[PDB]
Amino acid sequence: PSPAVVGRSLVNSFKQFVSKDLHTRHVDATYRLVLDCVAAVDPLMRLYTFGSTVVYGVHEKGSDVDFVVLNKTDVEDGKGGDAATQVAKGLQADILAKLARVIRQKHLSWNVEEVRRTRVPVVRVKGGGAVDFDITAYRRNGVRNSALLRAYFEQNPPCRWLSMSIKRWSKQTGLNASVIGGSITSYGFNLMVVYYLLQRNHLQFVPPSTIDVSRVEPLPPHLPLEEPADEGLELGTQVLDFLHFFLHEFDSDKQVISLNRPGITTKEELDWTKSAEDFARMNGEKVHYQWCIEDPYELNLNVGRNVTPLKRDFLRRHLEKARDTALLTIV
Ligand SMILES: Nc1nc2c(ncn2[C@@H]2O[C@H](COP(=O)(O)OP(=O)(O)OP(=O)(O)O)[C@@H](O)[C@H]2O)c(=O)[nH]1
Numbered sequence: 001p002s003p004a005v006v007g008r009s010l011v012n013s014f015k016q017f018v019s020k021d022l023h024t025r026h027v028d029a030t031y032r033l034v035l036d037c038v039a040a041v042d043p044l045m046r047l048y049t050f051g052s053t054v055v056y057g058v059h060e061k062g063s064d065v066d067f068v069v070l071n072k073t074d075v076e077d078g079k080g081g082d083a084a085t086q087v088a089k090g091l092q093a094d095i096l097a098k099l100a101r102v103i104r105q106k107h108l109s110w111n112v113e114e115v116r117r118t119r120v121p122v123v124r125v126k127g128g129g130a131v132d133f134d135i136t137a138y139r140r141n142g143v144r145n146s147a148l149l150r151a152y153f154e155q156n157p158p159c160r161w162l163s164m165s166i167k168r169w170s171k172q173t174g175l176n177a178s179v180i181g182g183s184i185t186s187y188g189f190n191l192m193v194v195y196y197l198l199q200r201n202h203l204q205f206v207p208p209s210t211i212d213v214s215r216v217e218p219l220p221p222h223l224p225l226e227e228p229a230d231e232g233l234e235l236g237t238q239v240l241d242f243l244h245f246f247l248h249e250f251d252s253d254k255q256v257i258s259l260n261r262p263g264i265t266t267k268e269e270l271d272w273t274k275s276a277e278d279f280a281r282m283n284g285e286k287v288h289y290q291w292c293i294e295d296p297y298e299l300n301l302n303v304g305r306n307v308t309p310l311k312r313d314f315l316r317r318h319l320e321k322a323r324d325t326a327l328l329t330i331v
C-alpha cells in the first residue's frame with residue numbers, strides 16, 4: 001500500500017475516536033474525587049497526573065488515568081531521582097494502604113486493588129463508569145517522563161496520531177505489555193515513536209534533565225487534537241517510514257532507542273550486552289537486552305527488558321505485516 005492508502009484507512013479507523021469530545025476536562029472530577037480521598041489521609045499531600053492523559057493532552061477511551069501522591073518536599077525537589085530501595089517501596093505501600101482504605105470507605109462500589117506484582121507499589125481502581133485509574137506515591141519519574149513526552153508532542157502536535165496509531169496496533173497484535181504474551185508497554189512504544197521522529201528531524205532534541213517537576217501542572221491543560229487535514233498522507237508516510245526504520249535502519253543488535261542523547265546510543269557504551277544478561281535481574285527475573293530502550297530517568301532500566309529473542313522475532317514479523325495491512329486497518 002501507498003502512504004495515501006495507509007493514510008486514508010488510518011483516518012477512517014479513527015473516525016469514531018474523533019467523533020466524541022477529546023477534552024481532558026473530564027478528568028477534573030475524578031482528580032477532585034481522588035484528592036478528596038488523599039486529603040483524608042493528609043490534607044498537605046499533592047495529587048499529580050501523568051500517563052497518556054498528560055502525554056497527549058487528550059483523554060482516550062480504554063485508557064486509565066495515572067495519579068501519584070506527592071509531598072510538598074517531593075515537588076520542590078523537581079529534578080531529583082527516585083530511590084530504588086526497599087525502604088522507599090515500604091513508604092509507598094504504607095501510604096497507599098491507608099489511601100486504599102479511604103477509597104473503599106468513601107466508595108463502597110469501587111474495586112480497590114492493592115497490586116503487589118510490581119517494582120512500584122500501585123493501587124488499581126475500577127469504579128464502573130470506566131472510572132479507571134492507578135495511584136502511586138512519592139515518585140517523580142512518571143510525571144517527569146510524561147512531561148518530557150508531552151513537551152515533545154507540543155513541538156509537533158499532529159505526531160500524536162503516529163503515536164496513537166502505534167499504541168492501538170501494539171495492543172491489536174499482542175505486542176503491548178497490556179496483553180498476555182506482550183513485551184513492550186505503551187510507554188515503550190512512545191519512546192520508540194519519539195526516537196524515530198528525532199532521527200528524522202521531525203522533532204528537536206529536549207534534554208531530559210531540563211524537565212522540572214516543581215514547574216509541571218498537577219493537571220495539565222487540554223491540547224486539542226484535530227483530524228489529519230491532508231487526507232492522512234503525512235500520517236501514512238510517517239507510519240511506513242516508522243516501520244521501515246525499525247525493520248531496516250535501527251540496528252537492534254548494536255543500538256539503543258534512547259532520548260537521553262541526540263544521535264546514536266550503543267549497547268556497548270551502556271554495557272547492555274550478553275554478559276550483562278547473565279548478571280542482570282529485575283524484580284526477581286532475567287532482563288533481556290535484545291531490544292534496547294533506555295529509560296530517560298531511571299538508572300539502568302531497559303524498557304525492552306522483557307523482549308526475549310522470541311518476542312523480538314514476533315516484533316520484526318509484526319513490523320513486516322504492518323506495512324501490508326496499514327497497521328491492521330486494511331482488513
Ligand atoms: N519504568 C517503567 N515505567 C513504565 C513502563 N510502562 C509504563 N510506565 C509508567 O506508567 C506511566 C504511564 O504508562 P502507560 O500506562 O504504559 O502509558 P500510557 O501513555 O498511559 O498508555 P495507556 O494507559 O496504555 O493508554 C508512565 O509515565 C511510566 O512512568 C515501563 O515499561 N517501565
Ligand SMILES: [Mg+2]
Pocket residue numbers: 051052063064065066
Ligand atoms: Mg496509563
Ligand SMILES: [Mg+2]
Pocket residue numbers: none
Ligand atoms: Mg499502564
